[PDB]
Coordinates of C-alpha atoms in Angstrom, one line a residue:
Chain A
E1 CA -23.6 -41.3 11.1
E2 CA -23.2 -37.9 9.5
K3 CA -19.8 -37.7 11.3
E4 CA -18.8 -40.7 9.0
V5 CA -20.6 -39.9 5.8
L6 CA -18.6 -36.7 5.8
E7 CA -15.5 -38.8 6.5
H8 CA -16.1 -40.9 3.5
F9 CA -16.8 -37.8 1.4
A10 CA -13.5 -36.3 2.4
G11 CA -11.7 -39.6 1.8
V12 CA -12.9 -39.9 -1.7
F13 CA -10.3 -37.2 -2.7
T14 CA -7.3 -38.7 -1.0
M15 CA -6.2 -41.5 -3.3
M16 CA -5.5 -39.4 -6.4
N17 CA -2.0 -38.2 -7.2
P18 CA -0.8 -35.1 -5.2
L19 CA -0.1 -33.2 -8.4
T20 CA -3.8 -33.0 -9.0
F21 CA -4.7 -32.9 -5.3
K22 CA -3.0 -29.5 -4.9
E23 CA -4.8 -28.0 -7.9
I24 CA -8.3 -29.3 -7.2
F25 CA -8.5 -27.7 -3.8
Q26 CA -6.3 -24.7 -4.7
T27 CA -9.1 -23.8 -7.1
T28 CA -12.1 -24.2 -4.6
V29 CA -10.9 -23.7 -1.0
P30 CA -12.6 -20.3 -0.5
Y31 CA -16.1 -21.6 -1.4
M32 CA -15.9 -24.5 1.1
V33 CA -14.6 -22.1 3.7
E34 CA -17.6 -19.9 3.1
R35 CA -19.9 -22.9 3.3
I36 CA -18.5 -24.0 6.6
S37 CA -19.5 -20.6 7.9
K38 CA -23.1 -21.8 8.4
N39 CA -22.2 -25.4 9.3
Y40 CA -20.7 -25.8 12.7
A41 CA -20.2 -29.5 11.9
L42 CA -19.2 -29.5 8.2
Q43 CA -15.6 -28.5 9.3
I44 CA -15.3 -32.2 10.1
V45 CA -14.6 -32.5 6.4
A46 CA -11.6 -30.2 6.7
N47 CA -10.5 -31.9 9.9
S48 CA -10.5 -35.3 8.2
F49 CA -8.9 -33.9 5.0
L50 CA -6.1 -32.4 7.2
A51 CA -5.6 -35.6 9.3
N52 CA -5.7 -38.4 6.8
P53 CA -4.0 -36.3 4.0
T54 CA -1.2 -35.9 6.6
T55 CA 0.1 -38.4 4.1
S56 CA -0.1 -35.4 1.7
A57 CA 0.2 -32.3 3.9
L58 CA -0.3 -30.1 0.8
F59 CA -3.8 -29.2 1.9
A60 CA -2.3 -27.6 5.0
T61 CA 0.1 -25.6 2.8
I62 CA -2.7 -24.1 0.6
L63 CA -4.9 -23.5 3.7
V64 CA -2.2 -21.4 5.4
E65 CA -1.6 -19.7 2.1
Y66 CA -5.2 -18.6 1.9
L67 CA -5.5 -17.8 5.6
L68 CA -2.5 -15.5 5.4
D69 CA -4.3 -13.6 2.7
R70 CA -7.6 -13.4 4.7
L71 CA -5.9 -12.6 8.0
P72 CA -6.8 -8.9 8.2
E73 CA -10.5 -9.8 8.3
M74 CA -10.0 -11.7 11.5
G75 CA -10.7 -9.6 14.6
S76 CA -13.4 -7.6 12.7
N77 CA -15.9 -10.1 11.6
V78 CA -16.3 -11.9 14.9
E79 CA -18.3 -14.8 13.5
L80 CA -15.8 -15.4 10.7
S81 CA -12.9 -14.6 12.9
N82 CA -13.9 -17.7 15.0
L83 CA -13.8 -19.9 11.9
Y84 CA -10.4 -18.6 10.9
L85 CA -9.2 -19.2 14.4
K86 CA -10.5 -22.8 14.4
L87 CA -8.8 -23.5 11.0
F88 CA -5.5 -21.9 12.2
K89 CA -5.5 -24.1 15.3
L90 CA -6.3 -27.1 13.2
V91 CA -3.4 -26.5 10.8
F92 CA -1.1 -25.8 13.8
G93 CA -2.1 -29.1 15.3
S94 CA -1.3 -30.8 12.0
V95 CA 2.4 -30.1 12.4
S96 CA 2.2 -31.6 15.9
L97 CA 0.7 -34.8 14.4
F98 CA 3.5 -34.8 11.8
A99 CA 6.6 -33.4 13.4
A100 CA 8.2 -34.7 10.2
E101 CA 7.5 -33.2 6.8
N102 CA 5.3 -30.5 8.3
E103 CA 8.3 -28.4 9.6
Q104 CA 9.2 -28.1 5.9
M105 CA 5.9 -26.5 4.9
Chain B
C1 CA -10.0 10.8 27.6
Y2 CA -6.7 11.3 29.4
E3 CA -6.9 8.1 31.4
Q4 CA -4.4 5.6 30.2
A5 CA -6.8 2.7 30.1
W6 CA -8.4 2.6 26.7
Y7 CA -11.9 1.7 28.1
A8 CA -11.9 5.1 29.9
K9 CA -11.1 6.9 26.6
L10 CA -14.0 5.1 25.0
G11 CA -16.3 6.3 27.7
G12 CA -15.1 9.8 27.1
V13 CA -15.6 9.5 23.3
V14 CA -19.1 8.1 23.7
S15 CA -20.0 10.9 26.0
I16 CA -18.7 13.3 23.4
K17 CA -20.8 11.6 20.7
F18 CA -24.0 11.9 22.8
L19 CA -23.3 15.5 23.8
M20 CA -22.6 16.5 20.2
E21 CA -25.7 14.9 18.8
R22 CA -28.2 15.8 21.5
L23 CA -27.6 19.4 22.5
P24 CA -28.4 22.4 20.3
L25 CA -25.5 23.6 18.1
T26 CA -25.3 27.1 19.6
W27 CA -24.0 25.3 22.7
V28 CA -21.8 22.8 20.8
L29 CA -19.8 25.6 19.0
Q30 CA -18.6 27.0 22.3
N31 CA -17.0 23.7 23.3
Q32 CA -15.9 22.5 19.9
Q33 CA -12.3 23.2 20.6
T34 CA -12.3 21.3 23.9
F35 CA -14.0 18.3 22.2
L36 CA -11.4 18.5 19.4
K37 CA -8.4 18.6 21.8
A38 CA -9.7 15.6 23.8
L39 CA -10.5 13.6 20.7
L40 CA -7.1 14.3 19.1
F41 CA -5.3 13.3 22.3
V42 CA -7.3 10.0 22.4
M43 CA -5.7 8.9 19.1
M44 CA -2.3 10.5 19.8
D45 CA -1.9 8.5 23.0
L46 CA -2.7 5.1 21.6
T47 CA 0.1 4.0 19.3
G48 CA 1.3 0.8 20.9
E49 CA -1.5 -1.8 21.1
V50 CA -4.2 0.8 20.4
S51 CA -7.5 -0.5 21.6
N52 CA -10.7 -2.4 20.9
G53 CA -11.4 0.2 18.2
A54 CA -11.0 3.4 20.2
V55 CA -9.2 5.3 17.5
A56 CA -11.8 4.4 14.9
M57 CA -14.5 5.6 17.3
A58 CA -12.5 8.8 17.8
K59 CA -12.0 9.5 14.1
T60 CA -15.7 8.9 13.3
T61 CA -16.8 11.2 16.2
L62 CA -14.3 13.9 15.1
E63 CA -15.5 14.0 11.6
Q64 CA -19.1 14.0 12.7
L65 CA -18.3 16.9 15.0
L66 CA -16.6 18.9 12.2
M67 CA -19.5 18.3 9.8
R68 CA -22.0 19.3 12.4
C69 CA -20.2 22.5 13.5
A70 CA -19.1 23.8 10.1
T71 CA -22.5 23.3 8.3
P72 CA -23.9 26.7 7.3
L73 CA -27.1 27.8 9.0
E74 CA -32.1 31.6 9.4
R75 CA -28.5 32.8 9.9
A76 CA -28.7 34.8 13.2
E77 CA -25.6 36.9 13.2
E78 CA -24.4 36.0 16.7
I79 CA -24.5 32.3 15.8
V80 CA -22.4 33.2 12.7
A81 CA -19.9 35.1 14.8
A82 CA -19.6 32.1 17.2
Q83 CA -19.3 29.7 14.2
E84 CA -16.4 31.7 12.6
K85 CA -14.6 32.1 15.9
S86 CA -14.8 28.4 16.6
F87 CA -13.8 27.6 13.0
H88 CA -10.7 29.9 13.3
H89 CA -9.7 28.2 16.5
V90 CA -10.1 24.7 15.0
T91 CA -8.2 25.6 11.8
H92 CA -5.4 27.0 13.9
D93 CA -5.2 23.9 16.0
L94 CA -5.3 21.5 13.0
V95 CA -2.7 23.5 11.0
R96 CA -0.4 23.6 14.1
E97 CA 0.4 19.9 13.8
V98 CA 0.2 18.8 10.2
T99 CA 4.0 18.3 10.6
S100 CA 3.7 16.5 14.0
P101 CA 6.0 13.4 14.5
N102 CA 3.0 11.2 15.4
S103 CA 1.9 9.9 12.0
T104 CA -1.5 8.6 13.2
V105 CA -2.5 12.1 14.2
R106 CA -0.7 13.7 11.2
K107 CA -2.7 11.8 8.6
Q108 CA -5.9 12.4 10.5
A109 CA -5.2 16.1 10.7
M110 CA -4.6 16.3 6.9
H111 CA -7.8 14.3 6.2
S112 CA -9.7 16.5 8.7
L113 CA -8.6 19.6 6.8
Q114 CA -9.8 17.9 3.6
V115 CA -13.2 17.2 5.0
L116 CA -13.5 20.6 6.6
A117 CA -12.7 22.4 3.4
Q118 CA -15.0 20.1 1.3
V119 CA -17.9 20.7 3.7
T120 CA -17.8 24.4 3.1
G121 CA -17.6 26.6 0.0
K122 CA -13.9 27.2 0.5
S123 CA -10.7 25.5 -0.5
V124 CA -8.1 24.0 1.8
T125 CA -5.7 26.8 1.1
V126 CA -8.5 29.4 1.5
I127 CA -9.0 28.1 5.1
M128 CA -5.2 27.9 5.6
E129 CA -4.4 31.5 4.7
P130 CA -5.0 33.1 8.2
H131 CA -2.8 30.5 9.8
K132 CA 0.3 30.5 7.7
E133 CA 2.1 32.1 10.6
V134 CA 1.7 28.9 12.7
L135 CA 3.6 27.1 9.9
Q136 CA 6.1 29.8 8.7
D137 CA 9.3 29.0 10.4
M138 CA 9.8 25.2 10.2
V139 CA 8.0 23.9 7.1
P140 CA 11.2 25.2 5.5
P141 CA 13.6 23.5 7.9
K142 CA 15.2 26.2 10.0
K143 CA 18.2 26.1 12.4
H144 CA 19.7 22.6 12.7
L145 CA 20.4 20.4 9.7
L146 CA 17.8 17.6 9.0
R147 CA 20.2 14.9 10.1
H148 CA 20.2 16.1 13.7
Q149 CA 16.5 15.7 14.3
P150 CA 15.1 12.3 15.2
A151 CA 14.0 10.2 12.2
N152 CA 10.3 10.3 12.9
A153 CA 10.4 14.1 13.2
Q154 CA 12.1 14.1 9.8
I155 CA 9.3 12.1 8.3
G156 CA 6.8 14.4 9.9
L157 CA 8.5 17.5 8.5
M158 CA 8.9 16.1 5.0
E159 CA 5.3 14.8 4.8
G160 CA 4.1 18.3 5.9
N161 CA 6.3 19.8 3.2
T162 CA 4.8 17.5 0.5
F163 CA 1.3 18.1 1.6
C164 CA 1.7 21.9 1.8
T165 CA 3.4 22.1 -1.6
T166 CA 0.9 19.7 -3.3
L167 CA -2.0 22.2 -2.8
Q168 CA -2.6 24.0 -6.1
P169 CA -2.1 27.5 -4.6
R170 CA 1.0 26.0 -3.0
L171 CA 1.3 27.6 0.4
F172 CA 5.0 28.1 1.2
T173 CA 6.4 27.2 -2.2
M174 CA 10.1 26.5 -1.9
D175 CA 12.8 27.9 -4.1
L176 CA 16.5 27.0 -4.4
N177 CA 17.5 30.7 -4.8
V178 CA 16.5 31.3 -1.1
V179 CA 18.8 30.3 1.7
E180 CA 18.3 27.0 3.5
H181 CA 15.9 25.9 0.7
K182 CA 18.8 24.7 -1.3
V183 CA 20.2 23.2 1.9
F184 CA 17.0 21.2 2.5
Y185 CA 16.7 20.1 -1.1
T186 CA 20.3 19.0 -1.3
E187 CA 20.2 17.2 2.0
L188 CA 17.2 15.2 1.1
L189 CA 18.6 14.6 -2.4
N190 CA 21.7 13.1 -0.8
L191 CA 19.5 11.1 1.5
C192 CA 18.0 9.6 -1.6
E193 CA 21.5 9.1 -3.1
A194 CA 22.4 7.1 0.1
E195 CA 21.2 3.8 -1.4
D196 CA 24.4 2.2 0.0
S197 CA 24.9 1.2 3.6
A198 CA 28.0 3.4 3.8
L199 CA 25.9 6.3 5.1
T200 CA 23.5 4.2 7.1
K201 CA 26.3 3.9 9.6
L202 CA 25.5 7.4 10.8
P203 CA 24.3 7.6 14.4
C204 CA 21.0 9.3 13.6
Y205 CA 19.9 6.3 11.4
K206 CA 22.0 3.4 12.5
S207 CA 19.6 2.8 15.4
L208 CA 17.0 1.5 13.0
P209 CA 18.3 0.0 9.7
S210 CA 14.8 -0.1 8.3
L211 CA 15.4 3.1 6.4
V212 CA 12.6 2.5 3.9
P213 CA 9.8 4.9 5.1
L214 CA 12.3 7.7 5.4
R215 CA 13.4 7.2 1.8
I216 CA 9.8 7.0 0.7
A217 CA 9.2 10.4 2.3
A218 CA 12.3 11.7 0.7
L219 CA 11.1 10.5 -2.7
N220 CA 7.7 12.2 -2.2
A221 CA 9.5 15.4 -1.2
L222 CA 11.5 15.3 -4.4
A223 CA 8.4 14.6 -6.5
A224 CA 6.5 17.5 -5.1
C225 CA 9.5 19.7 -6.1
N226 CA 8.8 19.5 -9.8
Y227 CA 7.4 23.0 -10.3
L228 CA 10.8 24.7 -10.1
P229 CA 12.7 24.2 -13.3
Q230 CA 16.4 23.6 -12.7
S231 CA 16.1 20.4 -10.7
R232 CA 15.3 18.1 -13.7
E233 CA 18.6 16.3 -14.0
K234 CA 19.2 15.5 -10.3
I235 CA 15.6 14.8 -9.5
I236 CA 15.1 12.4 -12.4
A237 CA 18.5 10.7 -11.8
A238 CA 17.6 10.0 -8.1
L239 CA 14.0 8.9 -9.0
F240 CA 15.3 6.4 -11.6
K241 CA 18.0 5.2 -9.3
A242 CA 15.1 4.4 -6.9
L243 CA 12.9 2.8 -9.6
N244 CA 15.8 0.4 -10.2
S245 CA 16.0 -0.4 -6.5
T246 CA 15.9 -4.1 -5.5
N247 CA 13.6 -3.3 -2.6
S248 CA 10.1 -4.0 -4.0
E249 CA 8.5 -1.7 -1.4
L250 CA 10.8 1.1 -2.5
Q251 CA 10.3 0.2 -6.2
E252 CA 6.6 0.6 -6.0
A253 CA 6.8 3.9 -4.1
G254 CA 9.1 5.2 -6.8
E255 CA 6.6 4.1 -9.4
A256 CA 3.8 5.9 -7.4
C257 CA 5.6 9.2 -7.0
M258 CA 6.8 9.3 -10.6
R259 CA 3.1 9.7 -11.4
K260 CA 3.1 13.0 -9.7
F261 CA 6.5 14.0 -11.0
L262 CA 5.8 13.4 -14.6
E263 CA 3.4 16.4 -14.7
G264 CA 6.7 18.3 -15.4
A265 CA 9.5 16.6 -17.3
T266 CA 7.3 14.1 -19.2
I267 CA 9.6 12.7 -21.8
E268 CA 13.0 14.0 -20.7
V269 CA 13.5 10.4 -19.6
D270 CA 12.8 9.0 -23.0
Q271 CA 15.0 11.7 -24.6
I272 CA 17.9 10.8 -22.2
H273 CA 17.3 7.1 -22.2
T274 CA 20.4 6.6 -20.0
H275 CA 18.0 6.4 -17.0
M276 CA 16.8 3.2 -18.6
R277 CA 20.1 2.0 -20.0
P278 CA 21.2 0.4 -16.7
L279 CA 18.4 -2.1 -17.6
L280 CA 19.0 -2.8 -21.2
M281 CA 22.5 -4.5 -21.2
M282 CA 21.5 -7.0 -18.6
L283 CA 18.0 -7.2 -20.1
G284 CA 19.3 -9.6 -22.8
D285 CA 21.2 -12.7 -21.8
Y286 CA 19.2 -15.9 -21.1
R287 CA 18.8 -16.2 -17.4
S288 CA 19.4 -12.6 -16.1
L289 CA 15.6 -12.0 -15.8
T290 CA 14.6 -12.4 -12.2
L291 CA 11.3 -11.3 -10.7
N292 CA 12.7 -7.9 -9.9
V293 CA 13.8 -7.3 -13.5
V294 CA 10.4 -8.1 -14.9
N295 CA 8.6 -6.1 -12.2
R296 CA 10.8 -3.1 -13.0
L297 CA 10.1 -3.5 -16.7
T298 CA 6.4 -3.6 -16.3
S299 CA 6.7 -0.6 -14.0
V300 CA 8.8 1.6 -16.3
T301 CA 6.5 0.7 -19.2
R302 CA 3.2 1.2 -17.3
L303 CA 4.4 4.8 -17.5
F304 CA 6.2 6.0 -20.7
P305 CA 4.0 3.6 -22.7
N306 CA 6.0 4.2 -25.9
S307 CA 9.1 3.0 -24.1
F308 CA 9.4 -0.2 -26.1
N309 CA 8.9 -1.4 -29.7
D310 CA 8.2 -4.6 -31.6
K311 CA 11.7 -6.0 -31.6
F312 CA 11.9 -5.7 -27.9
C313 CA 8.6 -7.7 -27.7
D314 CA 10.3 -10.4 -29.8
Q315 CA 13.3 -10.4 -27.5
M316 CA 10.9 -10.8 -24.5
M317 CA 9.1 -13.7 -26.2
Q318 CA 12.5 -15.3 -26.8
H319 CA 13.3 -14.9 -23.1
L320 CA 9.9 -16.3 -22.2
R321 CA 10.7 -19.5 -24.1
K322 CA 13.5 -20.3 -21.6
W323 CA 11.3 -19.9 -18.5
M324 CA 8.4 -21.7 -20.1
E325 CA 10.8 -24.7 -20.6
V326 CA 12.3 -24.3 -17.2
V327 CA 9.1 -24.4 -15.2
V328 CA 7.9 -27.5 -16.8
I329 CA 11.3 -29.2 -16.5
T330 CA 11.5 -28.3 -12.8
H331 CA 8.0 -29.5 -12.1
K332 CA 8.9 -32.7 -13.9
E333 CA 10.1 -18.6 -9.1
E334 CA 9.7 -19.9 -12.7
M335 CA 5.9 -19.5 -12.9
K336 CA 6.0 -16.2 -11.1
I337 CA 8.5 -15.1 -13.7
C338 CA 6.4 -16.3 -16.6
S339 CA 3.1 -14.8 -15.4
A340 CA 4.7 -11.4 -15.1
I341 CA 6.3 -11.8 -18.5
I342 CA 2.9 -12.5 -20.1
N343 CA 1.2 -9.7 -18.2
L344 CA 3.9 -7.3 -19.5
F345 CA 2.7 -7.6 -23.1
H346 CA -0.8 -6.5 -22.1
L347 CA 0.5 -3.2 -20.9
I348 CA 2.9 -2.1 -23.7
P349 CA 1.4 -0.8 -26.9
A350 CA 3.3 -1.4 -30.2
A351 CA 3.2 -5.1 -29.5
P352 CA 2.3 -6.8 -32.8
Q353 CA -0.8 -9.0 -33.0
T354 CA 1.5 -11.5 -34.8
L355 CA 3.1 -12.5 -31.5
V356 CA -0.2 -14.1 -30.5
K357 CA 0.6 -17.3 -32.4
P358 CA 4.2 -17.8 -31.1
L359 CA 3.5 -17.1 -27.5
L360 CA 0.3 -19.2 -27.6
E361 CA 2.4 -22.1 -29.1
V362 CA 4.7 -22.3 -26.0
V363 CA 1.8 -21.7 -23.6
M364 CA -0.1 -24.7 -24.9
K365 CA 3.1 -26.8 -25.1
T366 CA 3.8 -26.2 -21.4
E367 CA 0.2 -26.5 -20.2
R368 CA -0.1 -29.8 -22.0
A369 CA 3.3 -30.8 -20.5
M370 CA 1.8 -30.0 -17.0
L371 CA -1.6 -31.4 -18.1
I372 CA -3.3 -28.5 -16.3
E373 CA -6.4 -26.7 -17.5
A374 CA -7.9 -25.2 -14.3
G375 CA -6.1 -22.8 -12.0
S376 CA -3.2 -22.3 -14.3
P377 CA -1.2 -19.1 -13.8
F378 CA -1.2 -18.1 -17.4
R379 CA -4.9 -17.7 -18.3
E380 CA -5.5 -14.4 -16.6
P381 CA -2.7 -12.4 -18.2
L382 CA -3.6 -14.0 -21.5
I383 CA -7.2 -12.8 -21.1
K384 CA -6.0 -9.3 -20.3
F385 CA -3.7 -9.3 -23.3
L386 CA -6.3 -10.5 -25.8
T387 CA -9.4 -8.6 -24.5
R388 CA -7.9 -5.2 -25.6
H389 CA -7.6 -6.2 -29.2

């Protein structure tokens, strides 16, 4: 049931207009990334928020924007490098899910 | 250490660490040079995919070794004789290759000299004096012209020149009066002047059109050449041609080296003002201001703070009006322009406090137009601008 309470929690953000969607998570992505560090399962939130907001696809844009910045840390902090790798693989899978409109981003 | 598989080099280095730490120093001094040669080769060899942190291991062990060996001692005289013998050997070795083509070892050698000097009651030059011979005949480039050596060797030579001439006693200070010093100076000056691709066609550089690190090294070479007097005009002209370069990486390097240069001709730029004129006439208009223009402005004003006055601030606010309108229109790049435009005012003095109200007017207009309060790009430069006064 947690695997669905998280789904609902992530979904609560989807319906609002993209113009506010981009800002709300542009302002707070790093904190949730840090929180996921001690939650092997909480990344389900990000997974759902990348899959269903495929109708938005902006979350992926800001996620890659942040991961580009934090890239050098990967390969040194093994524990966090793992999380970065998971997120990168997820965002790469995103474009596979949406061959359209993800190539642009 | 000489096996080509990095995990063998790591075994060598860990053996070195244990041997250095465990055994008494009287024994360590005797093999200091062997240790140093092996360790330096470890990092010299790996310049493709390096390792799982072999080079970091090597550098840490090398600095540990130097600190352990050079530490002053009871001061039994035989130990002192061994210590000074080993120190002379190590200093010779390190001085030998502060110009080496391999950068990863060049920078490590320079930093090693720094730490070695700092560890003891002596200056870098004080420990370099008995080894000037090892560096006499090339740190001023002898024999073939600079264009005939390979590019990386050129970078090594000029970096060694800048390091040697930066030291306050200035070992091997150059002078245009002497032969082949004017040749070196003029050759690298022309290199700087070769901003156009017309001279990148040359065989010695056409093989790699990157060209940027070489020009950075040339700029540093010019900048370290401030002490002699008669270069003012050409050095400044070249440096300000660079500061106006569209290459952001080159622009920031020019900014950085102008710091060192301005210990000489501080305000000859302001007096001349034609080094900055190539900016003014396009600095008006309505749309001429791209990201490069604003970045150059904030650069050339971060140094020479008095470079601008109130009326220029008014002109800049007038310009800001356009982009403030344009960003909101387009969203209904521009914001990257506007953020830099705002940040600029924070840097320049002589900006009237009266401009607070006008610029704040347009800021609020556009933020309301975008209906954004959190994460806006304009707050941070506003905070910086206001906090000072």
